[PDB]
Amino acid sequence: NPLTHSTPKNFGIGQAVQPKRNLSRYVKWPEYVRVQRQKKILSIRLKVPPTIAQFQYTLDRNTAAETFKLFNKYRPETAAEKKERLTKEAAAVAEGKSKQDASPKPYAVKYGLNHVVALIENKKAKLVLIANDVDPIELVVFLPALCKKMGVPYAIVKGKARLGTLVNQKTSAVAALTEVRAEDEAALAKLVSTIDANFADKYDEVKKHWGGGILGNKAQAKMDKRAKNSDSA
Amino acid sequence: RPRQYATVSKTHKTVSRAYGGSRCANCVKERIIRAFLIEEQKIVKKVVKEQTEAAK
Amino acid sequence: GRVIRNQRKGAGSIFTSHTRLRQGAAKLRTLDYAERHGYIRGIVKQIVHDSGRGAPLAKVVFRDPYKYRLREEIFIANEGVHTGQFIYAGKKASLNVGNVLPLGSVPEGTIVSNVEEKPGDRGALARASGNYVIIIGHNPDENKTRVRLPSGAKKVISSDARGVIGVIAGGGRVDKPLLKAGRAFHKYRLKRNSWPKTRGVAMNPVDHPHGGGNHQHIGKASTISRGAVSGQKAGLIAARRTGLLRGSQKT
Amino acid sequence: KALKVRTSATFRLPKTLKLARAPKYASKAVPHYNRLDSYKVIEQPITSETAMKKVEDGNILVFQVSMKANKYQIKKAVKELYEVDVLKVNTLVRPNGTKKAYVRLTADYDALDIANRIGYI
RNA sequence: UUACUUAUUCAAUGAAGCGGAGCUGGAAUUCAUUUUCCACGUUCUAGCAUUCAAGGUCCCAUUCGGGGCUGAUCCGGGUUG
RNA sequence: UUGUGACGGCCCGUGAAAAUCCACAGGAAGGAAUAGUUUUCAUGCCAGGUCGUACUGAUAACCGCAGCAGGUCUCCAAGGU
RNA sequence: AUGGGGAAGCUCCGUUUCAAAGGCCUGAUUUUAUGCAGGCCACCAUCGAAAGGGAAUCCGGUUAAGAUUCCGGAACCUGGA
């Protein structure tokens, strides 16, 4: 205490060397990082037609959790289970010469964009989940219209990676249930009611609603200041 | 020569004073005087600013 | 014909400037934070001759606000600046000769030099020896300072553009006769290969629009259109008038 | 999810892991034998009148040497061939394009002795 | 004659302080519903200004001494014009 | 004759570089008692590779068809008048 | 050269530019490697002078022809616990 002094460095505009402040707001980010940020910014600034921006209307976290829990219960069979099943069928057709139908009918979530689109065309699909992160949007941009035409409930969900985990891949971009078990048919119907409440019946409004057109922080502040000084009379 | 400076002893390349082999004796004296005087004036200026603000 | 000399001067082979002896580009301090919110004090370490430049240069040392480092800048010296002098660059710097205030901070009638054309370009206007800029006036809304340039031109520029206070040192230089092709030779030897000048009228018609004839005469009018082309633009380009003029500059 | 403090506004390439080569086959499959061995760097002696005077007087062997040999290899090869200790090696490239080495041995050894051992008087 | 910025265009920087936020006191038209700036220790001197910073706050199983906050405000991640 | 030194003229001409080598504020890292500091003080150990190197350089060794009165950069420089 | 951008292309520009651009000390230095919250950070390829800058050798002797290079003597510099 008697040997310690009070230094304090004065960080005025020309007094002392500045301390190591966090300069994350000024980092010279790499080109790919900058393109990522500016691509998102430009997509927000531009007036996106109702065909896009009907996406980014993803169902909320709670119902997404219920839907993905139901689908995870309806998850496909892994490779080890597939090999087990094939070996058991080989044994069955070896010993009883069974007609390859000893195995029960599977109940799995249908995935694959072409497969699911054909299922919707055939009206087989009970419920269809459409991701929002597909890099070319045209792959699924017509899907809400197709589901509305064929009367199959659809939900725009968050995460093609989530759908890929659901169907044991990295990315699925679409998932679909066409058949259900009676033990959770009631759960599926309850889920479909809310999913339809969000998407299938609000479809006409979603097709009229134009998205985008949001300006940056400084631009919002600028128009705020202009409006404030205009109506301040 | 600059490379010859590497072979010689340290006492040939400096002076026992502070800033020895870099600055002149009169330079060091002028800088000592300037440092002390300007710091004393800084103390006086700080005190006079504080006292005039306290009066105000 | 042939490619004429003023055409050849653009390929930049022997007509590039002789930059060996030069002391560096004479630019203001970069417009970082202190120059626009406060001031920063540097010291004029030395005032030196720059070859090809009639004005002396000032080597001013500033402290680095963010790192323990000394930043040396090469200024265009104004009259009165001396070694050991303190230079104050910034928005809050005082109206003293050698300071680098913005035009918004300086008042009307101020004599400024090394004035930035746009804020942060580190000095473009009134840099030759003896030259200066007059602060004609301000316009705070959509901040613009009107200034008078050394040629008499009116220029509206941003109120954030920096500029050193005073007149450029080394004035009166062109008041002395060179008296000698030798003095002209040494003047241009370290500027560029633009001397001596053969008259185009003394060339052959292959070498110039003016060359040829049994008498040394231009032949056609020496006033050339602005819409002329390279090889044609030799003479008086886009001249509004010619001949001796009875008048003064009148800004 | 917060961010990290970036004290410097400069982005630098991250120090990613640098693996070491683990080839699945050998490149040449047989290491070349010693290109410049003692019998290759020492080609043959030189038996001019001047060279023999050097051997008799200066305690210096004179040799024709591989053009790719240096004084280190000449020293080592003379040591390994003739079991002598050499003092200095001075090489030159002759106007006929061959390396000539003057190898001065120590006082322990006699150049004339070793020349008679090699075979040239 | 204009407004927006996000395309395109022009510059600078090691892309460092951009746009909006407040203790005690000041200019104090404010009819107790706060609109804008400063004390946020930089101007007589050719000095010095760097060790996660000294000081300040609760603890460490103690032998190189420390840890969080603060010093150095928060929010938006549009480097800025 | 050459080198060096202190000077004095000249310029709108003021006669730039880089490697490399030293030095200067700092004490971050150590110890006091058969040792802890010094390889910027003396002494002692070892090594120093590669390529060029001969000769002419000119009224005969270069170029000009040649052993051509031509052309071709430079250093040293005795005595008398 | 590169990064980038032109050009049908041979190639042209550009030389730090709208680029995520690298290297020396002890801890790690063996039931486990050069893997690691171990530190400083930020030259901004390269080529370009046998007259520019630059680490250090002299004397005497020796050959038919080489010598500041060989020999004798006497030194110096650079790099290595």
Whether the CB of D20 is less than 7 Å away from nucleic strand G comes out as: yes
Residues of C in contact with A9 (CB under 8 A): none
d(C-alpha C73, C-alpha C123), whole Å: 12
Report residue C24 as tokens. 């560096």
Whether the CB of D12 is less than 7 Å away from nucleic strand G comes out as: yes
Of C160, C130, C154, nearest in space to C37 by CA: C160
Alpha carbon of A114 to those of A136, A201, C108: distances in Å? 15, 25, 75
The answer to whether C38 contacts A17, with C-beta atoms less than 8 Å apart, is: no
Determined by which method? cryo-EM
Of A231, A106, A233, A232, nearest in space to A178 by CA: A106
Q: What is the DSSP letter of A60?
A: P
- The alpha carbon of B29 is separated from its chain's Cα centroid by a whole number of angstroms, namely 7
Q: What is the DSSP letter of A173?
A: S
C162 forms beta bridges with C102
> How many alpha carbons fall within 13 Å on the CB side of residue A190?
9
Q: What is the DSSP letter of B4?
A: G
d(C-alpha A140, C-alpha A51), whole Å: 10
In chain B, how long is the greatest CA-to-CA distance?
66
The answer to whether A27 contacts D11, with C-beta atoms less than 8 Å apart, is: yes
Angle C100-C106-C111 (CA atoms, 0-180°, nearest 5)? Answer: 75
CA of D36 to C1' of F69 (A): 59
Minimum CA–C1' distance nucleotide for C184:
F12
Residues of A in contact with D5 (CB under 8 A): 22, 24
Alpha carbon of C133 to those of C55, C74, C90, C94, C109: distances in Å? 16, 20, 19, 18, 9
D16 forms beta bridges with none
d(C-alpha D47, C-alpha A57), whole Å: 99
- SS3 string, chain C, reads CCCCHHHHCCCCCCCCCCCCCCCCCCCCCCCCCHHHHCEEEEEEEEEECCCCCCCCEEEEEEECCCCCCEEEEEEECECCCCCCCEEEEECCCCCCCCCCCECCCCCCCCEEECECCCCCCCCCECCCCCCCEEEEEEECCCCEEEEECCCCCEEEEECCCECEECCECCCCHHHCCCCCHHHHHHHHHCCCCCCCCCCHHHCCCCCCCCCCCCCCCCCCCCEECCCCCCCCCCCEECCCCCCCCCCCCCC
The answer to whether C64 contacts A12, with C-beta atoms less than 8 Å apart, is: no
CA of C68 to C1' of G21 (A): 26
Report residue D89 as tokens. 């090696």
Amino acid code (one letter) for C196? P
Tell me how crowded residue D35 is: count the other CB atoms within 10 A of its CB.
9
CA of D111 to C1' of G75 (A): 29
Alpha carbon of D84 to those of D45, D77, D104, D107, D117: distances in Å? 15, 10, 10, 11, 12
Tell me if residue A137 falls in helix, strand or coil: helix
Whether the CB-CB separation of D121 and D111 falls below 8 Å is answered with no
The answer to whether A28 contacts D10, with C-beta atoms less than 8 Å apart, is: yes
Whether the CB-CB separation of C239 and C233 falls below 8 Å is answered with no
d(C-alpha A170, C-alpha A111), whole Å: 12
> How many alpha carbons fall within 13 Å on the CB side of residue A59?
26
Whether the CB-CB separation of C122 and C74 falls below 8 Å is answered with no
- The residue of chain D nearest to residue A19, with distances taken between CA atoms, is D7
- In order, the DSSP letters of chain D are ------SSS---------PPP--SS-SSSSPPP-SS-HHHHEEEE---HHHHHHHHHH-EEEEEE-TT--HHHHHHHHHHHH---EEEEEEEE-TTS-EEEEEEEPTTS-HHHHHHHHT--
Minimum CA–C1' distance nucleotide for C180:
F12
Report residue D28 as tokens. 């040449």
Whether the CB of D88 is less than 7 Å away from nucleic strand G comes out as: yes
**Which residues make Cβ contacts (< 8 Å) with residue C116, sequence separation at least 6?**
C28, C122, C123, C124, C125, C157, C161, C162, C163
Query: Using CB atoms within 10 A of its CB, is residue A71 exposed (0-12), middle (13-18) or buried (19+)?
Result: buried
Report residue A111 as tokens. 């995935």
Residues of D in contact with A28 (CB under 8 A): 9-11
C94 touches A at CB < 8 Å:
no
Whether the CB of A28 is less than 7 Å away from nucleic strand G comes out as: yes
d(C-alpha D105, C-alpha D96), whole Å: 26
Question: Closest approach of chain A CAs to the CA of D30, in angstroms?
Answer: 45
Amino acid code (one letter) for A197? A
Report residue C184 as tokens. 């002209």
Start-to-end C-alpha separation, chain D: 91
Minimum CA–C1' distance nucleotide for A226:
E3
Phi/psi class of residue D13: alpha, beta or left (left: φ > 0; alpha: ψ in -120 to 50)?
Answer: beta
Residues of A in contact with C33 (CB under 8 A): 13
Report residue C197 as tokens. 């000048």
d(C-alpha C173, C-alpha C175), whole Å: 5
What are residue A227's phi and psi, to 5 degrees?
-65, -40
**Sheet containing strand D99-105, strands side by side:** D42-45, D60-65, D99-105, D86-93
Residues of A in contact with D11 (CB under 8 A): 27-30
Whether the CB-CB separation of C87 and C127 falls below 8 Å is answered with no
d(C-alpha C145, C-alpha C116), whole Å: 12
Of D73, D54, D71, D66, nearest in space to D99 by CA: D66
